[PDB]
Each structure stands twice: as C-alpha cells, then as structure tokens.
PDB file of N, CA and C in Angstrom:
ATOM      1  N   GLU H   7      85.310 101.081  92.821  1.00 21.43           N
ATOM      2  CA  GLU H   7      86.458 100.569  92.713  1.00 21.43           C
ATOM      3  C   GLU H   7      87.015 100.344  94.111  1.00 21.43           C
ATOM      4  N   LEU H   8      86.166  99.765  95.322  1.00 23.99           N
ATOM      5  CA  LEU H   8      86.605  99.401  96.464  1.00 23.99           C
ATOM      6  C   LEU H   8      87.159  98.020  96.471  1.00 23.99           C
ATOM      7  N   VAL H   9      87.933  97.385  97.347  1.00 24.49           N
ATOM      8  CA  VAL H   9      88.383  95.985  97.417  1.00 24.49           C
ATOM      9  C   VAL H   9      88.656  95.867  98.768  1.00 24.49           C
ATOM     10  N   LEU H  10      88.297  94.472  99.356  1.00 22.77           N
ATOM     11  CA  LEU H  10      88.539  94.434 100.810  1.00 22.77           C
ATOM     12  C   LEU H  10      89.879  93.366 100.816  1.00 22.77           C
ATOM     13  N   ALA H  11      90.779  93.888 101.992  1.00 26.88           N
ATOM     14  CA  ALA H  11      92.045  92.953 102.111  1.00 26.88           C
ATOM     15  C   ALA H  11      91.641  91.991 103.059  1.00 26.88           C
ATOM     16  N   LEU H  12      91.800  90.860 102.307  1.00 26.34           N
ATOM     17  CA  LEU H  12      91.506  89.315 102.639  1.00 26.34           C
ATOM     18  C   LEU H  12      92.558  88.862 103.668  1.00 26.34           C
ATOM     19  N   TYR H  13      93.644  89.264 103.764  1.00 24.29           N
ATOM     20  CA  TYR H  13      94.832  88.898 104.394  1.00 24.29           C
ATOM     21  C   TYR H  13      95.680  90.301 104.940  1.00 24.29           C
ATOM     22  N   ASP H  14      96.436  90.069 106.170  1.00 25.48           N
ATOM     23  CA  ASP H  14      97.492  91.051 106.265  1.00 25.48           C
ATOM     24  C   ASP H  14      98.662  91.102 105.056  1.00 25.48           C
ATOM     25  N   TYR H  15      99.353  92.088 104.766  1.00 24.79           N
ATOM     26  CA  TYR H  15     100.635  91.988 103.817  1.00 24.79           C
ATOM     27  C   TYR H  15     101.331  93.005 104.172  1.00 24.79           C
ATOM     28  N   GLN H  16     102.756  92.781 104.207  1.00 21.67           N
ATOM     29  CA  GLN H  16     103.656  93.972 104.665  1.00 21.67           C
ATOM     30  C   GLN H  16     104.371  94.090 103.505  1.00 21.67           C
ATOM     31  N   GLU H  17     104.794  95.422 103.073  1.00 20.23           N
ATOM     32  CA  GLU H  17     105.473  95.705 102.052  1.00 20.23           C
ATOM     33  C   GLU H  17     106.998  95.067 102.075  1.00 20.23           C
ATOM     34  N   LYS H  18     107.330  94.750 100.950  1.00 19.91           N
ATOM     35  CA  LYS H  18     108.709  94.216 100.867  1.00 19.91           C
ATOM     36  C   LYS H  18     109.713  94.780 100.042  1.00 19.91           C
ATOM     37  N   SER H  19     109.222  95.770  99.120  1.00 18.52           N
ATOM     38  CA  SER H  19     110.110  96.641  98.329  1.00 18.52           C
ATOM     39  C   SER H  19     109.097  97.892  97.787  1.00 18.52           C
ATOM     40  N   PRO H  20     110.236  98.530  97.283  1.00 16.40           N
ATOM     41  CA  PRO H  20     109.608 100.307  97.287  1.00 16.40           C
ATOM     42  C   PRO H  20     108.083 100.468  96.536  1.00 16.40           C
ATOM     43  N   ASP H  21     107.982  99.585  95.727  1.00 12.83           N
ATOM     44  CA  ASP H  21     106.713  99.737  95.052  1.00 12.83           C
ATOM     45  C   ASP H  21     105.476  99.250  95.889  1.00 12.83           C
ATOM     46  N   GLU H  22     105.748  98.892  96.921  1.00 13.37           N
ATOM     47  CA  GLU H  22     104.406  97.691  97.623  1.00 13.37           C
ATOM     48  C   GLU H  22     104.149  98.747  98.836  1.00 13.37           C
ATOM     49  N   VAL H  23     102.955  98.140  99.437  1.00 14.59           N
ATOM     50  CA  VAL H  23     102.132  98.827 100.139  1.00 14.59           C
ATOM     51  C   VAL H  23     101.613  98.001 101.398  1.00 14.59           C
ATOM     52  N   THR H  24     101.757  98.303 102.517  1.00 16.18           N
ATOM     53  CA  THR H  24     101.180  97.241 103.662  1.00 16.18           C
ATOM     54  C   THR H  24      99.537  97.807 103.928  1.00 16.18           C
ATOM     55  N   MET H  25      98.927  96.440 104.239  1.00 18.97           N
ATOM     56  CA  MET H  25      97.570  96.462 104.376  1.00 18.97           C
ATOM     57  C   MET H  25      97.486  95.526 105.652  1.00 18.97           C
ATOM     58  N   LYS H  26      96.151  95.542 106.419  1.00 18.05           N
ATOM     59  CA  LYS H  26      95.610  94.855 107.432  1.00 18.05           C
ATOM     60  C   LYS H  26      94.410  94.082 106.634  1.00 18.05           C
ATOM     61  N   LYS H  27      94.479  93.013 107.233  1.00 20.20           N
ATOM     62  CA  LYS H  27      92.997  92.126 106.903  1.00 20.20           C
ATOM     63  C   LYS H  27      92.004  93.013 107.323  1.00 20.20           C
ATOM     64  N   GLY H  28      90.824  93.184 106.413  1.00 21.76           N
ATOM     65  CA  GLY H  28      89.658  93.928 106.693  1.00 21.76           C
ATOM     66  C   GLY H  28      89.731  95.499 106.363  1.00 21.76           C
ATOM     67  N   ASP H  29      91.009  96.038 105.868  1.00 20.45           N
ATOM     68  CA  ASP H  29      91.161  97.237 105.412  1.00 20.45           C
ATOM     69  C   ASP H  29      90.401  97.295 104.150  1.00 20.45           C
ATOM     70  N   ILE H  30      89.388  98.322 103.856  1.00 23.21           N
ATOM     71  CA  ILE H  30      89.086  98.644 102.443  1.00 23.21           C
ATOM     72  C   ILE H  30      89.553  99.709 101.863  1.00 23.21           C
ATOM     73  N   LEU H  31      90.360  99.084 100.369  1.00 24.47           N
ATOM     74  CA  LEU H  31      91.342  99.740  99.624  1.00 24.47           C
ATOM     75  C   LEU H  31      90.636 100.365  98.547  1.00 24.47           C
ATOM     76  N   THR H  32      91.204 101.478  98.104  1.00 25.41           N
ATOM     77  CA  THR H  32      90.650 102.090  96.715  1.00 25.41           C
ATOM     78  C   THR H  32      91.543 101.292  95.693  1.00 25.41           C
ATOM     79  N   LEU H  33      90.878 100.487  94.655  1.00 28.57           N
ATOM     80  CA  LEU H  33      91.662  99.978  93.659  1.00 28.57           C
ATOM     81  C   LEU H  33      92.228 101.147  92.674  1.00 28.57           C
ATOM     82  N   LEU H  34      93.436 101.145  92.265  1.00 26.72           N
ATOM     83  CA  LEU H  34      93.867 102.273  91.505  1.00 26.72           C
ATOM     84  C   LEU H  34      94.290 101.631  89.877  1.00 26.72           C
ATOM     85  N   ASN H  35      94.548 100.408  89.844  1.00 28.60           N
ATOM     86  CA  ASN H  35      95.000  99.797  88.583  1.00 28.60           C
ATOM     87  C   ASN H  35      95.340  98.223  88.684  1.00 28.60           C
ATOM     88  N   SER H  36      94.237  97.570  88.150  1.00 29.68           N
ATOM     89  CA  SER H  36      94.332  95.964  88.164  1.00 29.68           C
ATOM     90  C   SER H  36      94.654  95.347  86.749  1.00 29.68           C
ATOM     91  N   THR H  37      95.647  96.133  85.908  1.00 28.50           N
ATOM     92  CA  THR H  37      95.970  95.622  84.860  1.00 28.50           C
ATOM     93  C   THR H  37      97.133  94.407  84.798  1.00 28.50           C
ATOM     94  N   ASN H  38      97.552  94.482  85.795  1.00 26.63           N
ATOM     95  CA  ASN H  38      98.582  92.934  86.023  1.00 26.63           C
ATOM     96  C   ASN H  38      97.758  91.871  86.926  1.00 26.63           C
ATOM     97  N   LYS H  39      98.023  90.702  86.560  1.00 25.75           N
ATOM     98  CA  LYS H  39      97.039  89.853  87.069  1.00 25.75           C
ATOM     99  C   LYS H  39      97.639  89.130  88.529  1.00 25.75           C
ATOM    100  N   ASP H  40      98.702  89.611  88.895  1.00 24.73           N
ATOM    101  CA  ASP H  40      99.254  89.166  89.897  1.00 24.73           C
ATOM    102  C   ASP H  40      99.476  90.136  91.164  1.00 24.73           C
ATOM    103  N   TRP H  41      99.588  91.589  90.596  1.00 25.78           N
ATOM    104  CA  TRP H  41      99.869  92.419  91.881  1.00 25.78           C
ATOM    105  C   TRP H  41      99.075  93.753  91.303  1.00 25.78           C
ATOM    106  N   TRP H  42      98.157  94.379  92.279  1.00 24.46           N
ATOM    107  CA  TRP H  42      97.085  95.602  92.022  1.00 24.46           C
ATOM    108  C   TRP H  42      97.716  96.817  92.644  1.00 24.46           C
ATOM    109  N   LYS H  43      97.655  97.930  91.983  1.00 24.82           N
ATOM    110  CA  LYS H  43      97.771  99.027  92.841  1.00 24.82           C
ATOM    111  C   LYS H  43      96.688  99.433  93.406  1.00 24.82           C
ATOM    112  N   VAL H  44      96.960  99.967  94.579  1.00 23.76           N
ATOM    113  CA  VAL H  44      95.675 100.370  95.714  1.00 23.76           C
ATOM    114  C   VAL H  44      96.065 101.592  96.302  1.00 23.76           C
ATOM    115  N   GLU H  45      95.165 102.117  97.035  1.00 23.20           N
ATOM    116  CA  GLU H  45      95.331 103.071  97.895  1.00 23.20           C
ATOM    117  C   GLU H  45      94.918 102.808  99.378  1.00 23.20           C
ATOM    118  N   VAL H  46      95.829 102.700 100.196  1.00 22.20           N
ATOM    119  CA  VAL H  46      95.693 102.335 101.666  1.00 22.20           C
ATOM    120  C   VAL H  46      95.941 103.458 102.439  1.00 22.20           C
ATOM    121  N   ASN H  47      94.680 103.872 103.107  1.00 24.66           N
ATOM    122  CA  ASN H  47      94.444 105.313 103.619  1.00 24.66           C
ATOM    123  C   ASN H  47      95.127 106.269 102.542  1.00 24.66           C
ATOM    124  N   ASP H  48      96.282 106.718 103.185  1.00 28.39           N
ATOM    125  CA  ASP H  48      97.191 108.014 102.391  1.00 28.39           C
ATOM    126  C   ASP H  48      98.092 107.502 101.311  1.00 28.39           C
ATOM    127  N   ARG H  49      98.332 106.110 101.245  1.00 26.09           N
ATOM    128  CA  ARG H  49      99.620 105.640 100.540  1.00 26.09           C
ATOM    129  C   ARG H  49      99.192 104.920  99.413  1.00 26.09           C
ATOM    130  N   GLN H  50      99.950 104.668  98.378  1.00 26.75           N
ATOM    131  CA  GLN H  50      99.723 103.915  97.228  1.00 26.75           C
ATOM    132  C   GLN H  50     100.549 103.045  96.885  1.00 26.75           C
ATOM    133  N   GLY H  51     100.473 102.058  96.296  1.00 24.50           N
ATOM    134  CA  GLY H  51     101.518 100.881  96.100  1.00 24.50           C
ATOM    135  C   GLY H  51     100.702  99.830  95.702  1.00 24.50           C
ATOM    136  N   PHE H  52     101.677  98.593  95.474  1.00 23.94           N
ATOM    137  CA  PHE H  52     101.059  97.324  95.063  1.00 23.94           C
ATOM    138  C   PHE H  52     100.881  96.386  96.145  1.00 23.94           C
ATOM    139  N   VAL H  53      99.894  95.523  95.652  1.00 19.98           N
ATOM    140  CA  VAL H  53      99.607  94.397  97.301  1.00 19.98           C
ATOM    141  C   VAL H  53      99.391  93.203  96.117  1.00 19.98           C
ATOM    142  N   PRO H  54      99.257  91.950  96.446  1.00 18.70           N
ATOM    143  CA  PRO H  54      99.183  90.920  95.622  1.00 18.70           C
ATOM    144  C   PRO H  54      97.477  90.609  95.400  1.00 18.70           C
ATOM    145  N   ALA H  55      97.352  90.640  94.098  1.00 20.81           N
ATOM    146  CA  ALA H  55      95.808  90.819  93.690  1.00 20.81           C
ATOM    147  C   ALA H  55      94.952  89.648  94.356  1.00 20.81           C
ATOM    148  N   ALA H  56      95.575  88.310  94.661  1.00 21.06           N
ATOM    149  CA  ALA H  56      94.987  87.522  95.171  1.00 21.06           C
ATOM    150  C   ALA H  56      94.632  87.441  96.780  1.00 21.06           C
ATOM    151  N   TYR H  57      95.150  88.460  97.225  1.00 20.90           N
ATOM    152  CA  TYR H  57      94.612  89.108  98.757  1.00 20.90           C
ATOM    153  C   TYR H  57      93.726  89.990  98.954  1.00 20.90           C
ATOM    154  N   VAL H  58      92.963  90.364  97.930  1.00 19.46           N
ATOM    155  CA  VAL H  58      92.100  91.188  98.050  1.00 19.46           C
ATOM    156  C   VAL H  58      90.905  91.011  97.088  1.00 19.46           C
ATOM    157  N   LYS H  59      89.564  91.386  97.500  1.00 16.87           N
ATOM    158  CA  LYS H  59      88.355  90.902  96.856  1.00 16.87           C
ATOM    159  C   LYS H  59      87.623  92.163  96.432  1.00 16.87           C
ATOM    160  N   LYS H  60      87.469  92.332  95.124  1.00 17.78           N
ATOM    161  CA  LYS H  60      86.438  93.338  94.645  1.00 17.78           C
ATOM    162  C   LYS H  60      85.083  93.249  95.284  1.00 17.78           C
ATOM    163  N   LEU H  61      84.587  94.504  95.487  1.00 21.39           N
ATOM    164  CA  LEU H  61      83.376  94.600  96.278  1.00 21.39           C
ATOM    165  C   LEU H  61      82.097  95.160  95.316  1.00 21.39           C
ATOM    166  N   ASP H  62      82.666  95.478  94.214  1.00 23.39           N
ATOM    167  CA  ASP H  62      81.647  95.876  93.175  1.00 23.39           C
ATOM    168  C   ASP H  62      81.948  95.009  91.715  1.00 23.39           C
TER     169      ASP H  62
END
C-alpha cells in the first residue's frame, strides 16, 4: 500500500493532509474515487487521488 506524491498539495480543510512531490505515502483508504486517505510521515488525512500513483 505505498503511493508516490506526483505533486505538492497543501491541506485546505480539517480532513486533509499536506504532502510534497516525491513523498512516499502509506495508502489507508482508496474507496472514494476523488480523495484517498494516506499517512504522510506521522499525520493521516485526505489528498486528491489523481495526485498520487500506486507503487504496487
């Protein structure tokens, strides 16, 4: 369940999390087609699904 951040994304609401391009994130929930829940270092939240790429 690893995904690569294709772009920077800065969180804009309570449920979101910030990532930087090239970060390797742990994918927690990909049930929604637009927003995926990931763990970015020590924080968890949503980012746009189109901005990350599954590695497996």
